[PDB]
Design a protein around this ligand. Structure first.
Ligand SMILES: OC[C@H]1O[C@H](O[C@H]2[C@H](O)[C@@H](O)[C@@H](O[C@H]3[C@H](O)[C@@H](O)[C@@H](O[C@H]4[C@H](O)[C@@H](O)[C@@H](O)O[C@@H]4CO)O[C@@H]3CO[C@H]3O[C@H](CO)[C@@H](O[C@H]4O[C@H](CO)[C@@H](O[C@H]5O[C@H](CO)[C@@H](O[C@H]6O[C@H](CO)[C@@H](O[C@H]7O[C@H](CO)[C@@H](O)[C@H](O)[C@H]7O)[C@H](O)[C@H]6O)[C@H](O)[C@H]5O)[C@H](O)[C@H]4O)[C@H](O)[C@H]3O)O[C@@H]2CO)[C@H](O)[C@@H](O)[C@@H]1O
Ligand SMILES: OC[C@H]1O[C@H](O[C@H]2[C@H](O)[C@@H](O)[C@@H](O[C@H]3[C@H](O)[C@@H](O)[C@@H](O[C@H]4[C@H](O)[C@@H](O)[C@@H](O[C@H]5[C@H](O)[C@@H](O)[C@@H](OC[C@H]6O[C@H](O)[C@H](O)[C@@H](O)[C@@H]6O)O[C@@H]5CO)O[C@@H]4CO)O[C@@H]3CO)O[C@@H]2CO)[C@H](O)[C@@H](O)[C@@H]1O
Ligand SMILES: OC[C@H]1O[C@H](O[C@H]2[C@H](O)[C@@H](O)[C@@H](O[C@H]3[C@H](O)[C@@H](O)[C@@H](O[C@H]4[C@H](O)[C@@H](O)[C@@H](O[C@H]5[C@H](O)[C@@H](O)[C@@H](O)O[C@@H]5CO)O[C@@H]4CO)O[C@@H]3CO)O[C@@H]2CO)[C@H](O)[C@@H](O)[C@@H]1O
Ligand SMILES: OC[C@H]1O[C@H](O[C@H]2[C@H](O)[C@@H](O)[C@@H](O[C@H]3[C@H](O)[C@@H](O)[C@@H](O[C@H]4[C@H](O)[C@@H](O)[C@@H](O[C@H]5[C@H](O)[C@@H](O)[C@@H](O)O[C@@H]5CO)O[C@@H]4CO)O[C@@H]3CO)O[C@@H]2CO)[C@H](O)[C@@H](O)[C@@H]1O
Ligand SMILES: OC[C@H]1O[C@H](O[C@H]2[C@H](O)[C@@H](O)[C@H](O)O[C@@H]2CO)[C@H](O)[C@@H](O)[C@@H]1O
Ligand SMILES: OC[C@H]1O[C@H](O[C@H]2[C@H](O)[C@@H](O)[C@H](O)O[C@@H]2CO)[C@H](O)[C@@H](O)[C@@H]1O
Lengths: 648, 648
């Protein structure tokens, strides 16, 4: 057998690791399938995409078109349906009718061999009619056949009967396909909506306590959930909820010795009170956890738990499974590091003595939390554990529970970040916090919305407990507003860490991205009621952004994104589309100074002609404008961080 | 099982059609194997390439290096040996010694756990010594172990004993490799030197006749071979040598009706005198063909025959195999076309009624000519026959006779041209004749010498009987000189069609690339002796170019090519290297005006420091210059078309 088939169909995309891992989508998401399709000689080709669902049933007729003339690159948009493992194939074929029509349109007016030409047409159309399933379509084609063969009609009339719009519509749906050749099937993994789209809020339950009991419980933290749901969040991400070690517990501001009252770091998991399958006693019991999960569910909030495969020196694993750790020649275990960061309060796990034991235990733990309603896991530092370990763990969990979503917190080099997404992580943290200039945002979002979208789903956290960017430090509230608009409108998934709304921006020291008095090392009570009363919170903006996202399908997808030129370096403009919904955003990246700019819209990318003027509504203010190809904007920090406009 | 192994090794290149077809090389040719290699955590990785020969035997130790810092892209140069089907694998591994050294160089001066660190080193070096085959290398490592453990030496001295150049040399050859993980093997097809490197000369034997018999024979045409060999050619390409049809024979200058004396076109193959396995009676017999092949061989010339799968209406196939043709409804067969070109003198072949019969007959024909010493075929218009047909034919022929070279004359779109090379064509015609400006040449050669070199070998014909470019038409002799220098120095395979040496450049009409009074349609006697005597031939330049190529290995490869900036649009500069051989070419593309320029050499690409000044010899003149990073050149049409320099 030959590698190339009768009609060449080559380099089908998307493809991930040469077909060894699936391309990704979620239910209702569109993307392009493409291929290089051509044939020998000068006659025309056609192509179509066959999508097969998890039961092997083919999807609808999906013809492709040549994407640019003379390139031989063909494409079609497909839309993912129900969740599961699908496949896609490109079918390529000679299109003899298109070729015959091209020649007949020339030869018939010229009087060149008109009887042969028309009989040749008649034979193609009768072959077309024989493959057509519907009676009325067949009759339409056969009437064209009879007209083509009718020697009593003028040549031009015989030809015209074969080129009618009604004949065209039949042949667009059921073309005559010669020498049909298929690509080898490629896999598509279709996952639930939340894998791509959702707003996330991170907070520490222990910080939501009372004057009588400063250490919050699941019951006290549950009373924070209504405010989180009212800001329009969908997912609450909790730091580790397990007992915390005492040996080498860290003190406040990342100091090495805890005092007697110090709470330690939740990531220093494990004590004689229990490990990763247990609840910190000060948070309450598993029954209290269940209450928290249930109250979250009532308010439209899913819980994401941190899963950090590491432990404190007091974790039961340390003496039960010594082979899960690297021991130095004196028998001791070195503390974990992620240079220049040091984690003196924990041991890292070693994987090569007992990989099977570790995987078995990992999936036991995850299934325990899954049985208590946790269907999302934020996986801590996955890039410091083996790639194939995650591949195995995720395949095991998703094999019985395909709805479970894993988020990779891998702030590392591009090859590792991409590979983790490709081996099964549904979502990835990103470089978003370090992309702040127009050039940085433009380049990075062009990457994320391009080929990477076949395997990676970005979660844009504007801050985390480990990342307070200088932009926020120096820009104050106007900068928090800008980064919220950007995160919420550039990615279908975004998030914030509690305190972002209050514009907390005091760093540990100059040149650090750590918070002063970080919540990782201490209880951090916040007077939410006071901040709301005093108007010192951007919760209203956050709430509005989430409402805009919920009302505009364009903001609930990733791949359709276009940057429009402006004449100011500090002003960025972009549009997103989904069906008839178009959102147009203009952001002033300068948190200190008012910017005036001309935004020049690429009108064809909005589906409009260059001369058109179309109404927009800025959803942040309710103000309506009329914008054409060139529009003045004025954006003032503290009043108008951005325009977030719908086309009406 | 998991897709990713213990140490990730991904996206191995080169790759062709995702590993379904081989990457290519020839004996003695170097190229780069690369991969993306990294691991979890912060410890170091290593990698190496394992090349396996046709008997499965591994090549030498071939360590890779990271190609640019922080990219995780690793590479090594490999060199192809004997012809056949090879494979290559990338092996990736943890490099614990490099990691330990990095930590020890920090921790030992700091006084941080120095006894543990040194003992840990001792145990690694012991493990390294256990895998080392040479006794002297083992003793070197074990002496380092004993020094590491020697508590009577200062800490810094214990460490330094493990970092000596002699220890380094052992570990460069036999590193301690943890967790060795392999890519899946990729195929490499290694072919003979001539597939990549050779100078080609096309001529029509029938034009080399005598006053007594104007239609040349193989015996008269053989007397042209000494001049061809003396110009330094390696391959003589003959147009079709078979009987020529009478029905619809073309007249002179592509007219539709032949007169009584008209010879017709050699591509109109076949008559009752025979088909593709026969000799035109006016050329003589098969015994005369054998004489011509034998005389060619004595002069170091291989014959390439045209193979054109098509025929005249008088070919025996027409009535013997009607199913090898497309018949219209009245039973007639339409003449072949390649729009806007019409081939009224031939029928094209149809492939879908009897593909097996056609393949069987095609390989019969090729094997016939192979039995008469023809080991190279110039395949006419392969892109008008099915791609999979050629894939099958070439695999059949190369299965018994892997030395046979097929050249694809496919002037068509890029997808088809690439695919034909990928399915088995050893060489390809190219866009060379339509790349004449500095920008065109630079861009096109960057493509050919880059990734395309894994599957395509270009044959740069400066002219053909179908292509007299306007550049040559308007530029005259100075333009013929420029295009010869370019073709001969940019590709390891180049060629000319007879008459190029005489600067024949009269077109059929303005705006055509056809020759006036084309040799395709008429006998074309040339007075070779006169042109040489009158100095109106560029044969001496052609001869010199071929001698330079034969003396400079840099010109017998494709992939190593670098363009150097000049400050004039009409002056192009490039270098090629192979081992210690470096050739530096500067060409004036203006055939009308003298150009003065500053050529600014990228000195690192010549393997030199920026401040160096190195002697060169212009091999066209024998003149010696001293060139550094910025050099004045003056190039005058009719005197100095170019400098073709060797570094001394
Ligand atoms: O002469 C009348 C005109 O003179 C005046 O203007 C010219 C300047 O004097 C001259 O310097 C040059 O200007 C440069 C300028 O210096 C440079 O900074 C730059 O400027 C540009 C800016 O960088 C840019 O930012 C922007 O602003 O634009 C600026 C303008 O372009 O580039 C200018 C242009 O240079 C380029 O074009 C010119 C013109 O086409 C071209 O030739 C002229 O300059 C060269 C070098 O300066 C002169 O050559 C002299 O030096 C060489 C080197 O020694 C002498 O050559 C002798 O030795 C060599 C051996 O090395 C020998 O050659 C043999 O070997 C070589 C291989 O090595 C073979 O290739 C040869 O075949 C072989 O023979 C040679 O035989 C021997 O003679 C030479 O004799 C000296 O004369 C030329 O004479 C100039 O014509 C230049 O190379 C190119 O780089 O150009 C100005 C003209 O535009 C007046 O202002 C003007 O009005 C007068 O009409
Ligand atoms: O569309 C949404 C928009 O709606 C509301 O805006 C109102 C606005 O309140 C109202 O006043 C009016 O806008 C007028 C404006 O009043 C008027 O002054 C004039 O604006 C010019 C402006 O005063 C002047 O400083 C300058 O501004 C900048 C340019 O816009 C910008 O393109 C840039 O140009 C720099 C140079 O670049 C090259 O070198 C070039 O060769 C050279 O020619 C350029 O000068 O920088 C300028 C200064 O830094 O030019 C302005 C002209 O456009 O005209 C405005 C247009 O009507 O109406 C709008 C409603 O459309 C709402 O208040 C606002 O917040 C919201 O954004
Ligand atoms: O006798 C036939 C023909 O021979 C000679 O043509 C040769 C060209 O001179 C030479 O460059 C090469 O052409 C290739 C080309 O290099 C390659 O890129 C591809 O061209 C594609 C374009 O890539 C594609 O964009 C599209 O071009 C558009 C263009 O973008 C648009 O702006 C506008 O100008 O219309 C164009 C046409 O749709 O399509 C072309 C393909 O149609 O393929 C080319 C080969 O087809 O090789 C040619 C010979 O094969 C003579 O120069 C020419 O006069 C003769 O007609
Ligand atoms: O907590 C650690 C770290 O966090 C923050 O860094 C983040 C960066 O701000 C952010 O941009 C991102 O960095 C990525 C980077 O985007 C990505 O391209 C890759 O970087 C490679 C380069 O591609 C590669 O060329 C090479 O860089 C060379 C450079 O070309 C050369 O000119 C010269 O400057 O040396 C450089 C270093 O060799 O290597 C780097 C890899 O080191 O990967 C980066 C990630 O490693 O994400 C960072 C967090 O993951 C803080 O900003 C930083 O201060 C903290 O130390
Ligand atoms: O208790 C261990 C360390 O916890 C934190 O570091 C976390 C980080 O907050 C989290 O985002 C990431 O996923 O994991 C690391 C490692 O656990 C503190 O920042 C450290 O100071 C603690 O040592
Ligand atoms: O006799 C058929 C045609 O032959 C020539 O065309 C050749 C061309 O010269 C050759 O390089 C290519 O490989 O094949 C074509 C087609 O045979 C003449 O140029 C045509 O006029 C003839 O009709």
């Amino acid at each position: 057998p030959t590698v190339v088939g009768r009609i060449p169909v080559l380099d089908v995309r998307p493809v991930v690791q040469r077909g060894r891992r699936p391309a990704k989508a979620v239910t209702g998401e569109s993307f392009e399938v493409s291929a290089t399709v051509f044939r020998e000689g000068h006659d025309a080709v056609g192509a179509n995409v066959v999508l097969r669902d998890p039961r092997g049933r083919p999807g609808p007729w999906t013809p492709m078109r040549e994407l640019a003339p003379g390139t031989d690159r063909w494409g079609a948009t497909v839309t993912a349906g129900e969740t599961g493992t699908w496949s896609y194939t490109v079918e390529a074929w000679g299109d003899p009718v298109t070729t015959w029509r091209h020649h007949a349109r020339i030869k018939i007016p010229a009087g060149l061999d008109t009887d042969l030409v028309l009989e040749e047409g008649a034979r193609l159309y009768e072959r077309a009619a024989a493959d057509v399933p519907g009676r009325e379509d067949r009759r339409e084609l056969l009437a064209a056949v009879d007209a083509l063969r009718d020697e009593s009609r003028p040549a031009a009339s015989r030809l015209a009967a074969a080129l009618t719009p009604q004949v065209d519509a039949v042949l667009a749906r059921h073309p005559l396909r010669d020498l049909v050749t298929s690509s080898d099937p490629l896999p598509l993994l279709v996952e639930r909506e939340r894998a791509l789209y959702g707003a996330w809020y991170e907070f520490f339950p222990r910080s939501e306590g009372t004057p009588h009991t400063p250490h919050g419980t699941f019951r006290t933290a549950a009373r924070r959930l209504p405010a989180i749901a009212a800001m329009g969040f969908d997912v609450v991400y909790l730091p580790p909820i397990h007992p915390i070690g005492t040996t080498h517990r860290k003190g406040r501001n990342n100091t090495l010795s805890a005092t007697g009252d110090d709470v330690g770091v939740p990531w220093a998991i494990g004590s004689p009170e229990g490990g990763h399958d247990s609840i910190h006693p000060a948070l309450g019991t598993l029954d209290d956890f269940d209450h928290f999960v249930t109250e979250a569910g009532k308010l439209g909030l899913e819980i994401a738990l941190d899963f950090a495969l590491q432990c404190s020196p007091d974790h039961p694993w340390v003496h039960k499974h010594p082979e899960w750790f690297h021991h130095r020649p004196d028998g001791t275990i070195a503390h974990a590091e992620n240079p220049p960061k040091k984690y003196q309060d924990i041991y890292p796990i070693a994987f090569d003595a007992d990989p099977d034991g570790l995987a078995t235990e990992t999936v036991r733990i995850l299934r325990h939390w899954m049985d208590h309603g946790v269907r999302i896991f934020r996986v801590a530092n996955p890039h410091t554990k083996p790639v194939a370990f995650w591949e195995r763990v995720i395949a095991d969990i998703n094999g019985t529970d395909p709805d479970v979503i894993f988020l990779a917190e891998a702030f590392t080099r591009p090859a590792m970040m991409a590979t983790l997404a490709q081996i099964g992580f549904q979502q990835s943290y990103t470089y978003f916090t370090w992309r702040n200039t127009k050039q940085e945002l433009t380049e990075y979002l062009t990457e994320l919305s391009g080929e990477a979208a076949s395997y990676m789903r970005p979660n844009f956290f504007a801050n985390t407990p480990d990342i307070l960017h200088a932009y926020l430090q120096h820009g104050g509230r106007p900068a928090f507003e800008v980064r919220a608009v950007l995160a919420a409108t550039l990615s279908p998934t975004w998030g914030i860490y509690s305190g972002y709304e209050l514009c907390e921006n005091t760093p540990l020291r100059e040149g650090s991205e750590e918070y002063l008095d970080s919540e990782k090392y201490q209880l951090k009570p916040r007077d939410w009621t006071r901040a709301a009363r005093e108007g010192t919170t951007i919760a209203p903006l956050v709430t509005r952004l989430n409402t805009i996202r919920r009302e505009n399908p364009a903001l609930r997808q990733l791949r359709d994104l276009h940057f429009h030129p402006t004449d100011k370096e500090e002003v960025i403009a972009y549009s997103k589309r989904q069906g008839s919904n178009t959102v147009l955003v203009v952001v002033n990246l300068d948190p200190r100074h008012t910017q005036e700019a001309t935004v020049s819209l690429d009108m064809p990318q909005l589906g409009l002609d260059w001369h058109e003027s179309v109404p927009v509504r800025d959803e942040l203010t309710g103000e309506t404008y009329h914008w054409g190809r060139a529009n003045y904007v004025r954006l003032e920090p503290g009043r108008t961080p951005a325009h977030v406009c719908t086309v009406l």
